[PDB]
């Protein structure tokens, strides 16, 4: 499956793609304002994620750090990134269908649109100014808006017992972005697409 990653932000971002225990395609790459990077993800990929990283510095070997979404200090991500990270999430070819969503469960750093480039389903988007409107206690000094689990580490925010409800903090993310997961047990906003669909992830979609 092809995923065209486009940076419409006025600032540079370092795209990342991983399934948690391995990179997807090259795993990561710099995207200056306006640049597009197309990656290929193997059919059947389960639990894949794509996100943007901001304010990164990498040496010649591809090692360094980013203020948001850092994945073990590597340019080419092999693991998931450090919150806050707005997440484009997908599981492909799961019993004949593709499943996609956007999640704020791990916080929000950059606005995003995640849409199919093929027929059969609709896209999802979270492009509100969550960082600007972020509740004081969730603001990340390093940049972005942290999710409450990251900040407070409680069973309720992290849904560790599998029994949690919405919270004042999750409701904030849900208010700004109704179409993205605001907490673990949020009413699903996952979209079902035809198996083997192709997609486009656009950072800063409304610009």
From Swiss-Prot:
Tree of life domain: Eukaryota
GO cellular component, one term: cytoplasmic vesicle
Major place of residence: cytoplasm
Localization: Cytoplasmic vesicle
InterPro entries reported in the protein's UniProt record: Osmotin/thaumatin-like_sf (IPR037176), Thaumatin (IPR001938), Thaumatin_CS (IPR017949)
Transmembrane region(s): none
PROSITE patterns linked: THAUMATIN_1, THAUMATIN_2
SMART domains documented for this protein: THN
Keywords: Cytoplasmic vesicle, Disulfide bond, Signal, Taste-modifying protein
Cysteines engaged in disulfide bonds, as pairs: 9-204, 56-66, 71-77, 121-193, 126-177, 134-145, 149-158, 159-164
Function of the protein: Taste-modifying protein; intensely sweet-tasting. It is 100000 times sweeter than sucrose on a molar basis.
Homology family: Belongs to the thaumatin family.
Entry protein name: Thaumatin I
Source species of the chain: Thaumatococcus daniellii
